[PDB]
Amino acid sequence: LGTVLGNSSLDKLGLDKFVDRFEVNEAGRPDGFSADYEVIIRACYMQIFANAYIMESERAEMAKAESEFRDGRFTVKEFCRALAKSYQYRKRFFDGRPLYGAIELCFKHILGRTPDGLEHYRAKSAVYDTKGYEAFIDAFFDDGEYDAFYDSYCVPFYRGHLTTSNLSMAAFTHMFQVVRGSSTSDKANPRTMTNQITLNQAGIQSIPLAVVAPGADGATFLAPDASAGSWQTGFSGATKARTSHGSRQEKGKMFRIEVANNTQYSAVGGGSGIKLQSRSGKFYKMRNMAPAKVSTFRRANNVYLVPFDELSATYIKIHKNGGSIASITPV
């Protein structure tokens, strides 16, 4: 939505729902009522599985640990640990994922920030390789961080966007790549589904990522991958570069514009409805006045670096092709 209007810029970023907080305020064991606890329990699944879907069959898994939260056994710290050790949590996040996809998830589930630097990744991966999985999970829970922010009776929440756990501006932007507003769950969200590491290249090098709001304009945009030129030989046509050095910084500052849905059916050349190359049905663009069968835009989502005085023109042309603009950040 809109960053002004009602004053609450963050809510319209998609993070409006996640304000709700859940601290058990009742001392002593529950007997009978099981309302408040079933709410806190449900919030633990909403945090730890990040809105993943668990069924009656899947409620039989972790039924014991669930019956130990309700007793003077586990704080929610330790209950959250018990949900994090179990068969389910490993099926979803660990077994499908790479150690760094999995690391990044474990911070979204357990701490609710993203990893910022590579040092977090080195620490947790090394704990993993020394000892295995359960000490990996403990090493999230058994640190100063969780204890300080949550205090063992608070169900975990997203705090990576907040300024109070300091992080870095990279962890801010990365925060929004990891959470895309209330529907998107770890399995459901694009670029984080299953095995793919949600952000490797970005997460390792602390690359700030332009933030695209959920819904709004080009919500369905995933960045095109870049290689490294000569060294480790790689394709050099795929995306615009983040940097723009100069002698073209003339004509005003460079704007890195992301365009989000490019498609044959949508691409029209400014004039409504699909243009026909031949009299009878042939629709792809002619190469040398010979039929080609190659898509006019080849891979949805190309980027544009455009200097300021060429903005308006570029801004027109995208809308001529029916491409929709995700995010435009000055570079």
């Binding site: 907080r21 601290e23 305020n25 009522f33 099981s34 309302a35 408040d36 079933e38």
Partner: protein, 164 residues
């Protein structure tokens, strides 16, 4: 136990701030709809027996197969378990009807109904037959009141949608 009072005290307590005028408006609404709800609770406390007798007799005016092989009809005792379970349901409809939220009915009856009904081979559909029978057998100005009947229907609907 989910009522207006427990909801607003619980929410404003979670917030941690004295109860503001908003919660005061909420309990204002509770004491507005109170007389209607208690009227329906009075009449349910009046004629609960015939309610449960027609509910069970209508439950076997439908599905007869229960008293066959046996699924559940192999004694007068198990059918007495039928009528006492409908006694418990109308007792919780009475309780929720007094409180004015589906809280007591949910925490006593509905929470964990499924494990029992799939485990001890109880078909829920016959419960549904009973409650839809009583829900069809109201009388608008003849029984209670516009407010009292609606209240009663709401509670009973919650039961069926918690079961089906």
């Amino acid at each position: 136990m989910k009522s207006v009072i427990t909801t607003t005290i619980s929410a404003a307590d979670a917030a941690g701030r004295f109860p503001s005028s908003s919660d005061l408006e909420s309990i204002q609404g509770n004491i507005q709809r109170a007389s209607a709800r208690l009227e329906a609770a009075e009449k349910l406390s009046g004629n609960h027996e015939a309610v449960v007798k027609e509910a069970g007799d209508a439950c076997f005016a439908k599905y007869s197969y229960l008293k066959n092989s046996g699924e559940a009809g192999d004694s007068q005792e198990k059918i007495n378990k039928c009528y006492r379970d409908v006694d418990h349901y109308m007792r919780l409809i009475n309780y929720s009807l007094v409180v004015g939220g589906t809280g007591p009915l949910d925490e006593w009856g509905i929470a964990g109904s499924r494990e029992v009904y799939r485990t001890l081979n109880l078909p829920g559909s016959a419960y549904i037959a009973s409650f839809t029978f009583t829900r069809d057998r109201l009388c608008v100005p003849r029984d209670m009141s516009s407010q009292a009947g609606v209240e009663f229907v709401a509670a009973l609907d919650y039961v069926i949608n918690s079961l089906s």
